[PDB]
Design a protein around this ligand. Structure first.
Ligand SMILES: CCCCCCCC/C=C\CCCCCCCC(=O)O[C@H](COC(=O)CCCCCCCCCCCCCCC)COP(=O)(O)OC[C@@H](O)CO
Ligand SMILES: CCCCCCCC/C=C\CCCCCCCC(=O)O[C@H](COC(=O)CCCCCCCCCCCCCCC)COP(=O)(O)OC[C@@H](O)CO
Ligand SMILES: CCCCCCCC/C=C\CCCCCCCC(=O)O[C@H](COC(=O)CCCCCCCCCCCCCCC)COP(=O)(O)OC[C@@H](O)CO
Ligand SMILES: CCCCCCCC/C=C\CCCCCCCC(=O)O[C@H](COC(=O)CCCCCCCCCCCCCCC)COP(=O)(O)OC[C@@H](O)CO
Ligand SMILES: [C][C][C][C][C]N([C][C][C][C][C])([C][C][C][C][C])[C][C][C][C][C]
Ligand SMILES: [K+]
Ligand SMILES: [K+]
Lengths: 317, 168, 317, 317, 317
């Protein structure tokens, strides 16, 4: 630790005092000679001719070599210990705008393909998960997501968003309760498995709940005969082969602040089917004709990629 | 073992196994047994959708892909997730309905533009499908026939009105 | 090992003898020149002008570089081997006032929050336990607590106290029998699971036995109707929301040595309910009125944090 | 990363400018003195006599030692991290004529005894497989053979051949479908277990299918009474005790291009039983008498090792 | 590998040739100056005054630093790789008088307390066995004892003795068959579990067979009523509380070569009960009176430790 610095100054005092009172040189010269001898620069312009001084250099050289080996001994121990700890997690996140993911599955792998790698930290405990996370370019933190103490290691207090996807709904509910105990304003996205636990996640404090098993079950039972709505879901929400559901905000000005939806006539002018308007953390599906657009509103619609561009320029001032 | 379950001569077969490899193998075996049976499979990885389609699956569902795309897009806004969760999972207010067109009921030979379905029933017409093919957002130069299926979103009070409107 | 030191002196003899009998310099100069050449200080005031001496320096330099690389080869091997061993335990405890914990559970995690980290050594064998111990700030020793040979690795002979909490009561009894075979005076604290094994731990040599499963079972069966005593236990022994059970010793003097419990009137003067007195490794619950306090006695009572201070100053001389 | 190079040039500018404007030496001398001071060569022919210059050397030496320790700090971190990654796979194959083996079993061990070690890369995921591969002299790549992303890590696009042998036929079929999605021309050799899946491997795109379980089952049921054909298979295809099945190509010229099989009379002249001819990725078992040899044809036959040599020289021009 | 040596000589040629043809010094001086510049000794008695030579030193110094860093890069990679391999076995035994132990159990731990640590190599494959072996002071080799290839890694061909104790008798028989295929003269000691497999181990080639389960089963069924013979076995063969069974050879001379057992009267003179005589790899239990001792014979007897000494001096010439 700090004992190395004390040892370095100890040998400096011994070299400077001995050379000063043996060769009769000045203090500014003895200090200069000590630094050019320990560093082994060796200018040789102030060599000690006295045989007693020669033995003083021999013991000074021995101490110089010893202080070099202890410096390497401490440096090697610090680096080996730090790399072993960092390899298996056991570290504290220092970022302040990262995204924390609790658990690891195929859905969490899908969302990494649309986000940065160094910005995402994965909090898990299994040994096999660590190798999968590393191959994806993300960061791995070793801990228990249901433990409040381990939730502070990932630094969820200053996190941009938290995504919870664990093995069971019991662990998902417990993880959300622990996050709300630390930070009451962070955004939480959670995945549900059973239909009965959808309301339990909202009571825990989840901002958005996604239930992929419920959606898949209903589509299976309704695709036995015709299954036309399963084609719409697969080709728009999953594959985006020809259509895509997008949400574009209304900027300041936007040439249409105040006009009604009927007057705008978005579908005929652009070609995008309007689903709803996002007025302040709520969705108004199929808004009435007397709805007037405002600033900062979000329009949800479905359209071709060459028609969405026709809409963004249409709402741009 | 697939012959013990009597997969030959059935309404449909639903395949949902622990991995995509087992699903592909099961679909291949079913196609070996019966060639005309309807198969509904579930995909886990995005890269295996085309593999399932080539194996012989008639309908492929990928909930993991949908969940991952909604997770990454809900960080900032998350309004699409609200729509999906309210119209496909919970069906709290609206739900997607597919109502077939019966024979000779007020709609044989009428175009989309003069049908005015949305302004008289309130159901948003997502698309119309005929012959295992879905036409999303049909153009006004389209004619309704007997047997066509209309895919739309509306309240239960509006679905009944639409069904009455499409009745003879 | 020690072959490095022999090699270092071997090259010193070769350099000093060759320079002495070739350049004609004195022994005190040849020894000085050898040390300023191997260390690569290079004053240059005694350079060998003879071409034969120049070749003698070339072979001396080659040996100097070789001895430097073998020194680094041995240092690196020693550090890498030591860090790999220490990472997975495999070390002997050298402390003499530490606390040894056998096994790992939630109860042992609770007692670490009231003790030092570097003072506690955990003796376990599972791989997952090692990571939990490290995150708590304690030290991990790899061994079998039921093995007497591994009990000496943790140095239980000179331990301040030993806490035993294993997976089964069979292992807890076996561990206590092994500790009493090494040291017959060390203090042992053990946790029991079954009610029938409470006496078996005392016969093995356990000084204090704690049975949390028996206490929890009786409270569950008596809390079906009213459960008022469960509120007392939870609010005093577990949470300490408003009350706390404390034990304060009687120092020398203490202004009350010799007075009776009736004369003291602790409850009215202070406000702490007196439960018993700890007279020499025994508890006298509800002492009689004819009980006279002595020096070194311990009073067990329940009171508010602002009333316990009123009692400590009342018994302080 | 690249911050080390910037730091090295930073201290060079400080040393050169200070010595130039303090000791009055030329720029070509200050640059020469800076390089002979940081490297600690120390010629000593331009020592600074000015006491202010001596303090300038002291701070220059301190920066020289600091830049040396940061260079070792970065070198050690790079080497330790790289060795830890390479030890457990997590690397990308850069070869372009290697052989990729998916899975590990006894059959894949048999084919390694007839191939090079550094030319073969094994793609697996189990921890115990890695040690077996290393003892065989091959290379280990950590990944999932059924994952297309991990199939590109092994670089199957530019592979000489791919051998697939996994735990189940479901995984074998899935692996072949993933290889054909990357490269449509690479040669795939796969092993089947069930007889019903032999055609499924060919539809997936396997060039050669081997079914050892089907061959062994038929031999077991036909060896109950006599089992003479099992002796032929074991002594020719497995052990090669006295016979061996070989295929020799027909080179350009070959003294027999155009002659019929009847005219050649291979069996009487040489002593090798002729089984078939490999005319362009097909096998003609027992060719008719009107078959004329061509250039590049392959003859499949059974004969003693001293008779195969009699055949190769017989077909050599 | 060997590319480092080529690089070291490459920079030597560049430094020597440039200094020779620029400063006009002799070849023996240019070679001397090159070695005192790369090693950074820096005598400074042949500094290049020419400015062109100064730039030649700058590029020579840069190459000197580069060759030093590549030497450290190769040394570090060699040491880190070797230590990682040696830590988890993966090494070949080079000893020629060691003892090889196949498998690990409590019986094999008992025999290590009477043998050297560095002389014993344990051949196993489990991960938990490696830590137990290291704590006992023995050496661990990673391999499969039933594999002939792994039996040559432990070097059983030149082994003093081999001890086989595996999980099942099927593996014990298979291991012995593999040892006899390598070396037909090495001594094999094997432990049997089932009584029916005692003869199977002898047919495999085991020199000595020990069956602890059979001995324990018979003692259990005969100790229900009295069990006096179990006391004899426990107090003589296991604990040696007061008696001990010993075998002492007859040296050359021995003052009794040729006398009969009746004439010797060992029991009355010494006090040791004579059980048998080991005449050439056979045991004659209760020898007849007409038995005459020879040279090299071994006497098996039971006696107190103070009576065995009375026998060794009685048979010593
Ligand atoms: C120039 C050539 C010099 C080479 C000397 C090398 C000395 C160091 C040799 C290697 C040091 C080493 O192996 O590390 C440990 C000692 O801790 C350490 O750092 C102890 C470092 C102290 C060494 C002090 C250096 C003065 C030598 C001055 C010589 C004059 C020039 C191990 O402990 P020990 O080795 O017991 O093995 C126990 C088994
Ligand atoms: C100044 C620049 C000098 C660089 C020389 C570097 C020499 C050492 C090179 C690296 C040494 C190394 O790789 O370590 C082992 C040898 O053990 C060792 O320590 C052996 C160390 C002996 C080296 C002796 C140094 C004299 C060189 C004097 C030159 C004149 C200046 C490996 O074994 P080998 O390398 O077989 O790889 C087997 C695969
Ligand atoms: C000649 C003899 C000199 C020996 C000085 C050795 C200094 C380095 C000592 C060891 C450096 C070390 O341990 O590595 C880390 C610091 O990062 C580093 O590289 C920091 C390296 C900066 C050191 C700068 C060297 C200037 C010394 C100039 C002296 C004049 C000659 C650890 O961090 P710290 O140590 O806080 O432990 C935290 C627990
Ligand atoms: C005296 C002070 C000098 C310090 C220079 C230190 C140079 C070496 C810096 C550290 C070298 C290092 O990090 O190792 C690798 C390069 O391989 C290596 O060995 C490459 C070694 C070549 C360095 C050649 C040294 C000439 C410098 C002459 C300066 C004049 C004095 C990594 O690769 P790179 O770093 O790309 O990181 C990729 C991420
Ligand atoms: C080749 C060889 C060389 C070496 C030298 N050094 C110096 C350093 C000092 C600092 C303090 C080392 C020495 C040690 C003792 C012997 C290094 C250098 C490198 C470059 C800079
Ligand atoms: K130096
Ligand atoms: K120097």
């Amino acid at each position: 630790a700090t004992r190395i610095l004390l040892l370095v100054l100890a040998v400096i005092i011994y070299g400077t005092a001995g050379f000063h009172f043996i060769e009769g040189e000045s203090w500014t010269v003895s200090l200069y000679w000590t630094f050019v001898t320990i560093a082994t620069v060796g200018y040789g312009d102030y060599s000690p001719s006295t045989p007693l001084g020669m033995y003083f250099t021999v013991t000074l050289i021995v101490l110089g070599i010893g202080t070099f080996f202890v410096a390497v001994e401490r440096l090697l121990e610090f680096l080996i210990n730090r790399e072993q700890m960092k390899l298996m997690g056991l570290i504290d996140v220092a970022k302040s705008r990262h995204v924390v993911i609790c658990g690891w599955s195929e859905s969490t792998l899908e969302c990494l393909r649309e986000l940065r790698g160094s910005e995402v930290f994965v909090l898990a405990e299994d040994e096999n998960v660590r190798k999968k996370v590393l191959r994806s370019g993300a960061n791995f933190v070793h801990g228990d997501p249901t433990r409040v103490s381990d939730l502070e290691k990932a630094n969820v207090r200053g996190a941009r968003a938290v995504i919870v996807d664990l093995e069971s709904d019991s662990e998902t509910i417990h993880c959300i309760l622990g996050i709300r105990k630390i930070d009451e304003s962070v955004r939480i996205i959670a995945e549900a498995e059973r239909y009965e636990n959808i309301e339990q996640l909202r009571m825990a404090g989840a901002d958005q709940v996604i239930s992929p098993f419920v959606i898949s079950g209903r589509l299976m039972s309704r695709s036995i005969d015709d299954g036309y709505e399963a084609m719409f879901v697969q080709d728009v929400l999953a594959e985006e082969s020809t259509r895509r559901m997008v949400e574009v905000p209304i900027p300041e000005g936007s040439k249409l602040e105040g006009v009604s939806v009927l007057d705008a006539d978005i579908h005929d002018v652009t070609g995008v089917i309007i689903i709803g308007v996002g007025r302040g953390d709520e969705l108004i599906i199929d808004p009435p004709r007397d709805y007037s657009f405002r600033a900062g509103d979000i329009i949800l619609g479905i359209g071709k990629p060459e028609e969405i561009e026709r809409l963004k320029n249409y709402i741009s001032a």
